[PDB]
Design a binder for this molecule. Sequence first.
Ligand code: PYC
Ligand code: MG
Ligand code: MG
Ligand code: MG
Length: 716
Amino acid sequence: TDRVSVGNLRIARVLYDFVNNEALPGTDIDPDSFWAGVDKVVADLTPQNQALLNARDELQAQIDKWHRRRVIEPIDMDAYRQFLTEIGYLLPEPDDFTITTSGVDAEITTTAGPQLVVPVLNARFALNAANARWGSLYDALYGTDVIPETDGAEKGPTYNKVRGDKVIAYARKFLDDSVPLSSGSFGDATGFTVQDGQLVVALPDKSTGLANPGQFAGYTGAAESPTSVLLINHGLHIEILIDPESQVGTTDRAGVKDVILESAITTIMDFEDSVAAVDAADKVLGYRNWLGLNKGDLAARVLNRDRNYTAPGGGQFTLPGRSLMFVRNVGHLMTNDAIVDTDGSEVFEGIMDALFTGLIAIHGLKASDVNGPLINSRTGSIYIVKPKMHGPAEVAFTCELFSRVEDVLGLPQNTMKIGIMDEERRTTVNLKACIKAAADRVVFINTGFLDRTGDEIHTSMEAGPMVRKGTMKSQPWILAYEDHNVDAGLAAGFSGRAQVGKGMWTMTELMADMVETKIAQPRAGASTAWVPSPTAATLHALHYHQVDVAAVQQGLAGKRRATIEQLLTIPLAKELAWAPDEIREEVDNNCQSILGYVVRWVDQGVGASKVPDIHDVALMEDRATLRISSQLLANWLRHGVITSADVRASLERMAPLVDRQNAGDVAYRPMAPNFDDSIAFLAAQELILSGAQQPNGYTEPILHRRRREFKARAAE
Ligand SMILES: O=C([O-])c1ccc[nH]1
Ligand SMILES: [Mg+2]
Ligand SMILES: [Mg+2]
Ligand SMILES: [Mg+2]
């Protein structure tokens, strides 16, 4: 139609122009050979990609059949596990080894701290995350519920001094716990001066330096009365801003205006579950943003420059002002019409992503203006997160794909590093082998709730009814999965070399609860964890100051805290474990999760936002929320727990609920009462009723189709 012919490919014009006009210039890759490479790589790797997807299907069918031919008391783990080994699901574990990945930035190998994930299609959000390397601690405490809004300390229309003073005292205590004075407390500090390269803090009666003088990293302005003071603890920077003339400064004993924390050390720019991209137009929007980020020129309003400091011993240095960027590609499943072949077949979206996000990322290894000076990776690496892989063969393929892209791009081999997401059972039980498959490219493994539970449900769909969604969070299989992931990471030498990450805090407004509970993640040996906002990044940073992750990691070394049996413990529900009203609540719960998420996705192409749940708690979940919820319902429908009338009834009374939760949104169009007119509603209905049939429970085939449907209707 409006496509460009390159060998066997018919490339969508919008994509072809974008690449020639925006992505290629400055890379010194010849446009003609770039496209011949796209054509070659797509032709060479497409059959293996598809072979892998059929492998998934062959394995699931065998497992479905195993449960079906069985009666059978509870499952015999010797039998189950022997079966899994026979069919090639459970592969033998390789001998110990250390990963050999190199050329990796210090933000990933060394520094422990928060990690942001943001929809790359949203330019404002993406710029915010990139700028979230540094955040105001005062703003974070004042603005959220960490400082509780009791009587007197309420956020008003204007400054509340009672609340402000609380904020100040919270931070002072943090200073004391993080960068202690030889004697006294920051709570009594009256001033700061840099004297003989040391930091000197003035107390009402005396003066003192730091217990560990070396925690002093620098300052701004004159040593004799600095405008700010730079500290360091556990690899992370803390900056005390000093200005008596500022609105908070006047109130402060030492003229302190704010405390700034190094927060989001790295950010993942996401093309997968947090965005809605169903065609060439949507992909180009994403690719364009990814390009602006890497060239430094994205504006929505710009990217921050690095920060200037004076060394304690007089010199004059810089710190990065931007979060170091990963990109998350889509996984192996989906195709996309941005390129079709002569036959009209869509091309695998994962393959395209490597080619185009890899091409684009070259700009980030280069001076940004194009004069200067920002850059992403200074060590010369491109950092790609790859989600939803199943097993070491799927990881090997991603490496081979990267190898071939690097060739087309003229990059050295292994420039393209992989972040291995551990969110599918066949990866979890073969984790060590997956890490070995990428032993020279891997910079990251991580765990999460949503996708991994959905796969857990879909895999054992035929075994019986599963426990509630809430129950899933604390089942034996997931707790083993969490620990087993750290163990594999630490045993492959990730400490000092690569990130070991944990899941997203989805409750954007529940910051007090986050600060209280998310500390478990670094205590479990995770050198990074996912946060929903720059504000959450700043608050989660506190955890890394309280917890010596490096030491925690050294302590876990050599431990084996999860057995294959634990990992293989299917979350089946006990002999009829729910009262009727409990069943209804769970059904409502899941139907609302789907409706609330689906409606924004199908109608508006939003893949991530603050979606009020059934109790009006704001959650920022990604598409994986659709996978658990619909799989759970599909499972319950499959095993007689609920009826199809139950599902339709729930959908019909949760729908208008969702409507009014989206009241105050001008573009929003309600689903109720003409349900079978809403494409969103029908998408929700299809996810559930077709759920047991989606490959590995994946929701994109259905979601993408319905979103495309909607876009077509809107085009009249
Ligand atoms: O909850 C999550 O996994 C998530 C990632 C990005 C936005 N939400
Ligand atoms: Mg996921
Ligand atoms: Mg310590
Ligand atoms: Mg199936």
